[PDB]
Design a protein around this ligand. Sequence first.
Ligand SMILES: *[C@@H]1O[C@H](CO)[C@@H](O)[C@H](O)[C@H]1NC(C)=O
Ligand SMILES: OC[C@H]1O[C@H](O)[C@H](O)[C@@H]1O
Length: 361
Amino acid sequence: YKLICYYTSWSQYREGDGSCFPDAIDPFLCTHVIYSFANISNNEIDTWEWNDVTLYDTLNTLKNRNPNLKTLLSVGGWNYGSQRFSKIASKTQSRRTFIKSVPPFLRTHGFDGLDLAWLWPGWRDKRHLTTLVKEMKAEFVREAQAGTEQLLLSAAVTAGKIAIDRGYDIAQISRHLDFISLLTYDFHGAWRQTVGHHSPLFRGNEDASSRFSNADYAVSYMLRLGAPANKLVMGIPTFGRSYTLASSKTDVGAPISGPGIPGRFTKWKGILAYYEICDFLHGATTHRFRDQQVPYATKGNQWVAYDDQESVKNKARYLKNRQLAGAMVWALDLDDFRGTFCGQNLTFPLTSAIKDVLARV
Ligand SMILES: *[C@@H]1O[C@H](CO)[C@@H](O)[C@H](O)[C@H]1NC(C)=O
Ligand SMILES: OC[C@H]1O[C@H](O)[C@H](O)[C@@H]1O
């Protein structure tokens, strides 16, 4: 079973104990560590941060400790225009340039493959995504002839039905792709004007309007679209999402003034790391959607949906049962990587729980 874990570049800037470098990653924790993100420039893959060449190095030296560790490099992310990606892919010449740029760069910096994070394609883009995957893989096949082990190619895929139908030929891309990481953590946002969970496993017959907005739909549906189970990797968030409440209503349907306040360390409105969440839980009221099998918490005018060790195990079992290739984690830097915030003296609580479960019968 794969354990695909994402590291974010920009986690290096958070103050104090928030600062995460590739240093902190235990090299027997994951099977694949993916480095986000790379920039494209003159139609060629490129660094993003000023010191990625160093952080690249620091991550790829972990393979000294675990010779079996596979590392990849992710291109795009949200930071970065779909507009821009589309422009590069829809022309045969920029596409080619970008594809040829990729292996030499990967090799130079010691990566084992590429993750495409095009977030996300439009309906006009679906045709070019397929071609790009196809052609990129053919390139990885042709470079394998040179005696180095064949590069891996993977893709980050949105778990929302509307988005999958708009932007992805799943059946086709599944052939050329080594695995697909399904982003089953986005099933809600602050654009809905109430409370709700964003990673729920099941719809939970609290009240389908979306019966589509849950991990299980997303998984059935990708299999139904023809993603082999053995290429499919279910995404499990390590962060939580916060919402400022608009009243003392707190259950399902409770209205929302907007996103919750910034976390002390992550400093983004609407998001918290698990380590910031473990601290929030002190003096909060805890609840668990029975149906959807995920927890929330609330205190003051703050309401938080999150994943904890139990829900994360539970998702790990679900995917074993479903016979999928593994789990995908977003993200290491947002898990309790120092192991000091959540009571126990365990680092990467959330990710270890998955890993333990992935090793059971
Ligand atoms: C990424 O590449 C673009 C396009 O060349 C360039 O303008 C931009 O400044 C780069 N962004 C970063 C953060 O390096
Ligand atoms: O939902 C957008 C997400 O996709 C990216 O891959 C990250 O997981 C980012 O937060």
